[PDB]
A paper describes a structure:
In this study, the focus is on the essential Bromodomain protein 1 (PfBDP1) of the malaria pathogen Plasmodium falciparum. Possible targets are the nine predicted bromodomain (BRD) proteins, among which PfBDP1 has been identified as essential in the blood stage of P. falciparum. PfBDP1 is involved in regulating erythrocyte invasion genes and conditional knockdown (KD) of PfBDP1 lead to a significantly reduced multiplication rate during the intraerythrocytic development cycle (IDC). PfBDP1 is recruited to promoters of invasion‐related genes by binding with its BRD to acetylated histones.
Next, we investigated the influence of the meta position. Based on the affinity increase from MPM3 to MPM2, we assumed that hydrophilic groups improve affinity. Based on our models we assumed hydrogen bonds to the side chains of Gln365 and His354 for the sulfonamide variants. Next, we attempted to combine some of the best ortho modifications with some of the best meta or para substituents. Of the combinations tested, three molecules showed improvement over their predecessors. In addition to the interactions described for PfBDP1‐BRD‐RMM2, the structure of RMM21 confirmed the formation of hydrogen bonds to His354 or Gln365 with its sulfonamide, which is present in two conformations. Based on the two conformations of RMM23 in the PfBDP1‐BRD co‐crystal structure, this should be possible for RMM23 and RMM22, but not for RMM21 (compared to RMM20).
Numbering used by the authors: 1 to 120
The structure:
Amino acid sequence: SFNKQWYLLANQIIQSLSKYEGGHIFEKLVDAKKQNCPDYYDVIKNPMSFSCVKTKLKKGQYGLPTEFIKDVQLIFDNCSLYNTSGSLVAITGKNIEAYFNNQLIVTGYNNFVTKANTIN
Ligand SMILES: Cc1[nH]c(-c2cccc(NS(C)(=O)=O)c2C)c2c1C(=O)CCCC2
C-alpha cells in the first residue's frame, strides 16, 4: 500500500535519528525542572520529540508523508530557537537535521512526497 510504505520508511528514518550520536536528547520531551530550563515551554509553544513522532506513526495520525517531515523539522526548529547557535544542543540539532535531510533523499521518502503533492 502507498501509505503503508512511507509509514514503514518514516519508522526506519525516525529510528535512525534515535540511534544517531547525541540523538537521545531529542527522544523524549524536555522536562523543564529536570533539565534546568524552566522557560522552555514559554519559548517553545509546539514541542516535539522523536517519541511523539513514533507514537503518531504507531497510532496512524499522519495522512500525508509531508506531515512526518514537518514534525521532525519542528524538533530541529525548536532546537535552533531555544538554544544558542554554538551550544552543544544546537550543534547536535544541526548535525541530525543534516542527517535527516540526507536520509529523505537516499531512502526515497521525497518520492512519496512528490507523488502525494500531485494527488492533492
Ligand atoms: C532538545 C533538548 N534536549 C535536551 C536534553 C534532554 C534530555 C537529556 C539531555 N542530556 S543532559 C546530559 O542531561 O544534558 C538533554 C540535553 C535539552 C534540549 C533543549 O532544547 C535545551 C534545554 C534542555 C536540554
